[PDB]
Structure 1
């Protein structure tokens, strides 16, 4: 039925999951005859499920969440994503000007942005003060010193969801961004060239952190977002002082607290600078989430993604997910103090790179993430990370 659509997203729990149900219901109410069938998928399963399903578009989802960067382009090249250049609404064109570039490939728009999530450190202001950290660390050495103080003060300095691999890899991404010159970074990512020494130095700096033993003890078996003992869960329940994460963080924390209300003393600060690094000061890394349409989908799917972009729906999105909506005017309803600081951060950043693994693609990205975990587990080295990336890059 041309008016029945299958909708895949990654909000498997909490208010985010309920938001999509409500949006679907409101869409069905506003467009009688339409039916939205939802599949709420756990984030760590999403890419695998989507890529497998879209090998046969005729039986794949009509509307699905983006993977981002080269991972999107992979799907575009394979004929698994509809060009929406001439399909997106004036509302989207107007309100998502800044974020549409993330969904734009070869001058063509392939999705409707719904959220923007810069990365950085999310921390407990209370645990920081208890360790004698009165100022967020401007530099990496100061961050390391602060971790020592947090450890001495009887808490786990850094929550790390290393079982999911990418949360660990985020430390590596940021260190490369801080170490590599903007030129080397852009060329390295575009050409898949990882020969510059900065790719090794970043690994060595991360190994230094790991050898301080300031992670939560079970970090290798810790997921990012599943349960009270996930890395987000540890931060939410003040069992750990900080974690490096995207700006979806506040909404994940709020559903892992014992009363499932927002974390009271949540603070944010940008990933610090690295002495001797030639990275651009203030450079941002993050993600933009947009929703895509199956090339075989009907106009009903197009209407649904455009419906997401409507100001009221983006405002409800911001409230449900406690994150930054892609729609600029919708950002007015953002109340969380740390999110307001990230928005400012975002508004005057010199540039924003996409998450390194998404920017590099599935093969390199997955190889990189696993290699970072191997080093953190002591079964690998900084050199092995580069070798893993190079090996994977041979396939593309």
Structure 2
């Protein structure tokens, strides 16, 4: 059946999970005969099942969340993603111009975005004040100093979902972005060249954080978003002072609070500048969530991804996920004070890089993320991290 489509997403939080249910039925009532069969998938399994299912597109999902960056390009090159350049709506083209560049490859659009989520530090304002930190750290040393004060204050300074690998790696990403010059960074991503001292230095700076032992005790067995004891859950329940995460954070937090309501004292501050770093000041790194269409899918799928781009639907998305919607007009409904900061910093930032692992691809990304965890477990060095990236890069 054409008008029956298979829809894959990663919304495991209650409110966002329900948004998709309500969106599907809304699309089903406006387009009688259509049927959207939804599959909710935990984020850490998403890349695995998508790549596994799409090696035979005939029996894969019709509409699915993209993996992003080079990971999207891997699927595009493999013939697993449909060109939507001449298929996206005038609404999507107009309202979502800036986020559309993240789904644009070789001058061709391969998805409809729904949110833009820059990275940064999310923290408890109350835990900070309870440690004598009345001002956000502007530099990396200040951040280390503040973590010391939090540790003395009895609380774990930094929640880290190291079992999922990438949340730990995010500290390495940001440090590389801050240490390496914009060109060294660009060419390193484009050419997979990690020979510059940038990459070791960033690993060394991160090793210093590790040696302070200011993480939550079970960080190696802690996931990012699963349960009250996840790194996000620790922040939500004030068991930890902060964590380094994408702007999906407030929506994840409001799912893990004891009342499942928005975290009352959530604040945001950009990743600190690094003294002696050649990185461009104020350089953003983040994500852009968009949805792709199976090359073997019907027009019904196309009508569905464009339906997401609708301003009303984008706003309900912003409310349900407590995030920044991809649609510019839809951003008018954002009320979370920490998010309105991020939107402000978004409009006046020079660049926004994608996540480092998603920008380097599956092979390099997974190698890098694992290597960081190895170094953090004491079973690795900053040099091993770079060695791991170079090793995986041989495959492509």
TM-score (norm 2): 1.00
Distance 2:53 2:84 in 1: 21
Q: CA deviation at 1:14?
A: 1.3
Alpha-carbon RMSD: 0.3
Q: Can you list the C-alpha shifts for 1:182-224, whole angstroms capped at 9, x where unaligned?
A: 0000000100000000100000000000000000000000000
Q: Can you list the C-alpha shifts for 1:320-355, whole angstroms capped at 9, x where unaligned?
A: 000000000000000000000000010100100000
SS at match of 1:255: helix
Q: Can you list the C-alpha shifts for 1:355-389, whole angstroms capped at 9, x where unaligned?
A: 00000000000000000000000000000000000
* C-alpha contact 2:120 2:271 (8 A) present in aligned 1: yes
Q: Can you list the C-alpha shifts for 1:63-106, whole angstroms capped at 9, x where unaligned?
A: 00010000000000000000000000000000000100000000
SS at match of 1:114: strand
Distance 1:2 1:251 in 2: 34
Q: Can you list the C-alpha shifts for 1:256-289, whole angstroms capped at 9, x where unaligned?
A: 0000100000000000000000000000000000
Distance 1:292 1:381 in 2: 38
Distance 1:73 1:181 in 2: 25
SS at match of 1:157: strand
Q: Can you list the C-alpha shifts for 1:275-332, whole angstroms capped at 9, x where unaligned?
A: 0000000000000000000000000000000000000000000000000000000000
Q: Can you list the C-alpha shifts for 1:36-58, whole angstroms capped at 9, x where unaligned?
A: 00000000000000000000000
* C-alpha contact 2:85 2:110 (8 A) present in aligned 1: yes
SS at match of 1:97: coil
Give the structure 1 partner of residue 91 of structure 2: 91
Is 1:276 the counterpart of 2:276? The answer is yes
Distance 2:255 2:351 in 1: 31
SS at match of 1:184: helix
User: Which aligned runs of 4 or more in structure 1 are off by greater than 6 angstroms?
Assistant: none
Distance 1:343 1:66 in 2: 23
Distance 1:239 1:53 in 2: 39
Distance 1:11 1:263 in 2: 19
Give the structure 1 partner of residue 23 of structure 2: 23
* C-alpha contact 2:13 2:252 (8 A) present in aligned 1: no
Q: Can you list the C-alpha shifts for 1:149-202, whole angstroms capped at 9, x where unaligned?
A: 000001000000000000000000000000000000000010000000010000
Distance 1:55 1:114 in 2: 25
Distance 1:36 1:12 in 2: 18
TM-score (norm 1): 1.00
SS at match of 2:72: helix
SS at match of 2:256: coil
SS at match of 2:288: strand
Q: CA deviation at 1:13?
A: 2.7
Distance 1:279 1:134 in 2: 27
Q: Can you list the C-alpha shifts for 1:101-131, whole angstroms capped at 9, x where unaligned?
A: 0000000000001000000000000000010
Distance 2:310 2:26 in 1: 12
Distance 2:354 2:13 in 1: 25
Q: Which segments of 5 or more consecutive residues in structure 2 lack a partner in the other structure?
A: none
Give the structure 2 partner of residue 139 of structure 1: 139
Distance 1:232 1:367 in 2: 24
SS at match of 2:22: helix
Q: Which segments of 5 or more consecutive residues in structure 1 lack a partner in the other structure?
A: none
SS at match of 1:297: coil
Which moves more between the two structures, 351-360 or 9-18?
A: 9-18
Distance 1:394 1:325 in 2: 37
Q: CA deviation at 1:255?
A: 0.7
Give the structure 2 partner of residue 48 of structure 1: 48
Q: CA deviation at 1:12?
A: 1.8
